[PDB]
Symmetry: D2
Subunit: 485 residues, 4 copies
């Protein structure tokens, strides 16, 4: 078995908080209630003065992705260990299928690479980077048989991943047909391409060139465009890594307007800003380069946190895609060659608690919502995860909201040799992490093996996502006016 | 006992829906799960093809209020029966304390009148219609000992209930001190007073004069003003009967801005509009007169439903305050003498389901949120009510979302002899109502006695309301700059 | 000569109004002042009780355009006569160059067709419907030698006129280089194409299908996209025929944000709405079909007038492109074959005065601004036109704001056999029209010959348009951060 | 006479710019045109490479006001000299009538003090700081006989100037009756009073306490409230010293909504921000104290400039009300005793040109609009001032837009011994100032005598202000529905 009894703490779910013990057996929470009995042999974790919360679910990772030709240094093994140490018990990673390549083969390739290495549970989104009868069939197979209800499309990366409006329309339509959610990288790829070419010709080769060639308008525009196409075919839409105030306002307006869309800010865009691209030290500046870029407006992260609190934005990931200082350096003479991506998987939970809860922007319950419950709802395994209740998976974190910890590349568990949150003092510390009913992290120490985590197979037509979509198919059909010829 | 087993239906809570039976014993839900056993003697309600939902909680009623000198015809007895027949299992009624009168005496007077008559559970808000050391003391007593954490203040009704900005400030401050929520009637009382006087001098004595003398700008202005004062003292605010698009946009903006404020649209403003004040038939027009008025912009109710779906607005009441056709007629020659108030207590649930869920604006779960769960959170008895789960009160409705019913004063259970929703065909029918663990309504028939309902005593410092408030008291203190003299 | 003295009236310019006579000689206003002398032989027009205003300038016409294969019935001859009778003294018509066809040849072809026929002054925009070194050269020639500083690009009409984002970028850049303004037809051509295909498959072949396949979101999206691309290259942008509230709000927001963009609502979208597409009578419905379509939201025209008054929108045209009832009928079985376009050239001035000035939305001076002065500023001949002052062209209208006239296809001077403003009673009547210093219209009668009007040759780099653009090229250059390697 | 010929420069009016000489005789511009003849004895000012512009009109000054009991150090004599040296040729100063004091006596008192001292033209607004039959009569006398069409009301300064909503309503109504414009100090006086009391009790006595006790929400709220009351009585409204983004957004929204309201940002709020209140040096911080306060959001001045460019805000003043470092010091121990007010009269023109025109936010023509033309329109003497044209007053400035000057209390002409724009380098220098047809400022030297300026007597019912108001009285009357009893 391994039986665990978490005693003395306060359970925090999305809807409310209450004092209770949590009894874990065989991978599951089998009971929640006051003063539970300790069965002989069960380990007691003492949660007196702690919050007992669902482990974090990182909706957005790229572990060991080969990109910009090189591969991210946090791999499935180290990345998941780092997640665990930061209070995160599941990651959802993106299968980056290449143009013309089979989606199934790319899927197979990701499972073979991750299955023997994950230390926590995980699941996969699949990128749709080209279109054809074959892609259409493979998307159906993926949604019905391979446990994947999320497909990722790119409006940027011209020549590489980009799809045009007419292909987005076709792809979005077929997502709706197989009951998947459509995820979008929302930047105008034509403007990025022209922007970068122009920055280079002006001799602006540094990281400030990366942000200047694709300011937030270029994100906001594609965000609106994606919502418009999706709304036209009644397909549910998910906007990954919202980085800017204007793009977040597009999503906030579309939702007030009843559009079925979700916005996902990330740790990076909630915890720091793009003024770093202007840093005198090239290496420092290049640490922050990712697409879309962090924004030079200092009010951005606080504004994004306010919208996250208010549910204009709904859940969080990290877009963790790390490259060491010596890999970033591939672009020392040309910012278009800096491999894009920052850290976050480990620090997301503390970063959000410090910037969101300690600051008085959201309460502990909205915190649980935006770090696990909503991910589980949208990707279709709630309340299996994202909730502390009988029958749920025992992915649980004992959380100390009153103590602080400073984030540093010197004490973090990620492979990358720097940290975009370097120096930040955060209230909220994961003191014990439980994953699949086992104590994988306690007293600063990890105790877990590569392969201990499991792939989570999901069904299509997530209810949280589809109930309005289906009712609209029923009563929102356009009608003819009846006329003599 | 009276044991009941609700079998075969689909439970709908705020967060998700799932197939399960519900076992009720002695006033409580004692078990929720698949295929429960029928203990000998328990009555089985067959919920096959039905939704099993928390009974509705009407946040806003005025049963048998003596006003405009006369009294509303739906009293505590008939009003609660009508609630039950419409799927609503609790009402929160307002103690309308007069100027200079003790709040405790008015409280006592309301309990004595309602206790022997309610057929469903209820609770009370208390209006603070004047200010002084005595009112200050009585508010504390009410919050700590009389089960009341909501106080109602008026920006309209000059000479009668109105408080000025400096008194709102003092009152709002003391609400925060005793852990109450501040509710506001948000209209500019000076503009109403001048507006009405002007409409009369122009010979516009009909109901169109009532709306024209206080168009929605006059509501939006006071709504902003109330949020500003409340935000200044860090007091949580609740805006009752939001009737207009502009006033709802004020609340939507304040919340995106992190203000602690809740907006409460009502059945009336979600189900019909103010074009009715322009009806040729005087009696018809006067049916709709209430303050603030319904709006002549036909897009209003749909817009309010969109904001309710998106959580710019958060919960619903009815402001049920009814006067028969012959009482309305007191103002046949002068609209200022029409006793203000419309129906809704009975029809709220069906009205919202038809306009909100059937239309594809919100799903069944957000429906539960906005008809019971949020009321229970804000007024501080969740999940005791507002949720189908073990240990919760057995206030449950078996709901048929596929069948329609037409609303008519000929078939409704309210005392009033007309209905502002006359003729409306609504999907969503309450087929069985259970209150306090007893079947009080089934097959169109009510089975309940005056006095069967209970007053619900609440504690102050509702967590849903106060957790952000208290964290802001801790880290939002303004700080001095340290200076040589 | 032909000398004219306009005596006794009140001159209305964009900035103010004042009593004065206007002395016209040889095509020009040669004096403006109180009580001028009548030189022997000069004709006196008595303007007592009238406004004396600059003649209207219609920024947007398609006289006798061969399209959807057929040609509009108002040709240069009749269209300009109709303009004159409605108080409009200049039109700007679009050279609809076909894909792969020389822009110069299309220009030549338009001048040859219009020069011998116009009864009032005119000028031309040229559509850029494809891209290449040749188009690039011809645009320069057009701007420097052929009197054209406005180029028109299409985001709709896939396969026919449409340009993609990367071509818009290149085209917009070169517009800025030759000092032209970029005009855009802002609708997403991919969504229109898919929308229409879908409406047809659903058997919705009527005009309601035309609007439903491209609702206002599809306009708003392309409008934002165009502003974003234009802003990226610092190119001034002009959005033709704004038809919807949401697309007008995009332009209003971009301008508050300092973007150099102008929005042009038209008579149609200021004077009627798209509820007409739902008319039982097919012929009636099809009268209103144009791209983008009129909108079924009845508050649209009033809202557009409010933004026009407030300068969120800046000037007006008509998009006059008329087809007789028997030509519309080409699409009786399929709305995609209804030749697109409505009337307006003649009625624009009265329509705007009734809906804008009589209604109290704008004053007579803003009226002059939005019917002539702004057109002259943007297209680069102010104050040569658009102002009543010494040395300006004598294109003048004597305007009666107090009398009304009803618009009817029975009394209008347009070739088309119906009128989208049929029945409208408008305050504001053009009693005398003067064009090029000659009385071409008086007492309901026209007195003018085809060819009497002149092509107006303009220079590039309009100051109204370019002064901010050029200052931004000077101080808005992105700068490198100076770094050790 | 004194004849002057300004030769060789470029005339910049509100609508366009063009090369011409300007011939001045006897106080008036008597001719504008190319290459004018120099009559024997006329002085030639060589304006080669310069802009020739209408002199600035400062809509908002308090010269030598006795306040907070002490009097401002820039008096009518020095203040107007300083204006002249900064390119400003007229000021409009406020008669600060005390509570219970006759408005006529206060008017008389201001004219007697200013008439013998002004060096440039001026006019007066009159504050209405109490209400009664007498105030009502005196307002009529002022508007019809004393040349004053602007009355100033206070929503702040409780106990001192403040009027409540019902008095604002009555006052605003009577302004509309006498054809005046209503000006408002828009802050909630109750919140200020409570805010200050609270800051003091918390030991925050420094200038940061002044801003913290009345953050921008408190301005935005009163701004909305004033617009709402004014709109209710159809009275035109003018919001003085808009200091914040949120209050400017209230005015921007009300105007898009067709409300007759004008917003007036000032030099202070366009040129610096409230972060200065947090300065370690007490004397420095207190320099910036005025009501409402400058805002600690650094994006404020740029945002206000963007709205000024876009005409969400329409014209500028300075609220010049200066107190020397040793007078400010009256509040060294309590910020409520710092005499409120900053400098600006002299620097407004250069500040706006640097921040507005050089930055590429507005062009030179919009600059003229917002520094003179709009003031003249609203207060009812355009084009007598605010325009370079025949018959206009010769108040003219020769402006060098390419040269910069640094602003410093060491080189400024104001009496006050510091400058809130200290150190700012501004493009745009007034090289020659002409007032009433005389060269009063050239080569850094002033040549003018106290009393040389004249009071400008205005008429009521300014057309720019009233034409929409009057049309709305005609067609916006509310109508009765016709009904059998
Ligand atoms: Zn991405
Ligand atoms: Zn990513
Ligand atoms: Zn009320
Ligand atoms: Zn009420
Ligand atoms: Zn077009
Ligand atoms: Zn067109
Ligand atoms: Zn003031
Ligand atoms: Zn002032």
């Amino acid at each position: 078995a391994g039986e665990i009894l978490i005693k003395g703490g306060k359970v925090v779910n999305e809807d409310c908080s209450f004092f209770s013990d949590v009894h874990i057996r065989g991978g599951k929470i089998v009971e929640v209630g006051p003063d539970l009995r300790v069965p002989p042999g069960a380990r007691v974790i003492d949660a007196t003065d702690r919050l007992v919360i669902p482990g974090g679910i990182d909706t957005h990772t790229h572990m060991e992705l080969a990109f910009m030709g090189t591969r991210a240094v946090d791999d499935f093994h180290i990345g998941t260990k780092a997640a665990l140490a930061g209070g995160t018990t599941m990651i959802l990673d993106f299968v980056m299928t290449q143009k013309g390549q089979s989606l199934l083969e790319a899927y197979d390739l990701w499972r073979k690479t991750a299955d023997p290495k994950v230390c926590c549970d995980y699941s996969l989104h699949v990128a749709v980077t080209w279109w054809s009868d074959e892609v259409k069939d493979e998307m159906r197979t993926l949604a019905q048989e391979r446990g994947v209800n999320s497909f990722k499309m790119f409006m940027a990366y011209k020549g590489l991943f980009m799809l045009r409006d007419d292909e987005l329309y076709a792809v979005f339509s077929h997502c709706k047909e197989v009951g998947a959610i459509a995820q979008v990288h929302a930047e105008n790829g034509d403007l990025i391409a022209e922007g970068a070419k122009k920055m280079l010709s002006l001799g602006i080769t540094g990281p400030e060139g990366h942000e200047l060639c694709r300011p937030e308008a270029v994100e906001a525009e594609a965000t609106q465009r994606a919502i418009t196409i999706a709304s036209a075919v009644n397909c549910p839409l998910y906007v990954v890594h919202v980085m800017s105030k204007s793009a977040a306002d597009v999503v906030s307006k579309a939702r007030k307007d009843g559009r079925v869309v979700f916005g996902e800010p990330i740790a990076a865009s909630l915890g720091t800003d793009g003024t770093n691209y202007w840093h005198k030290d090239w290496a420092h500046a290049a640490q922050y380069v990712m697409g879309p870029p962090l924004r030079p407006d200092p009010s951005t992260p606080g504004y994004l946190m306010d919208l996250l609190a208010n549910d204009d934005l709904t859940l969080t990931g990290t877009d963790n895609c790390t490259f060491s200082r010596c890999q970033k350096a591939l672009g020392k003479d040309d910012f278009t060659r800096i491999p894009n991506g920052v850290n976050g998987v480990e620090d997301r939970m503390s970063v959000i608690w410090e910037k969101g809860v300690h600051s008085g922007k959201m309460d502990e319950n909205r915190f649980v919502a935006v770090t696990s419950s909503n991910a589980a709802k949208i990707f279709n395994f709630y309340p299996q995860k994202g909730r502390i209740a009988k029958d749920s998976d025992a992915d649980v974190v004992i959380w100390d909201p009153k103590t602080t910890r400073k984030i540093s590349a010197q004490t973090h568990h990620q492979a990358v040799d720097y940290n975009i949150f370097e120096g930040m003092e955060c209230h909220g510390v994961p003191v014990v992490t439980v994953s699949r009913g086992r104590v994988v992290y306690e007293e600063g120490r990890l105790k877990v093996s590569p392969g201990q985590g499991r792939f989570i197979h999901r069904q299509p037509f997530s209810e949280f996502v589809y109930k309005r979509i289906r009712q609209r198919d029923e009563v929102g059909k356009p009608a003819v006016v009846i006329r003599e010829p």
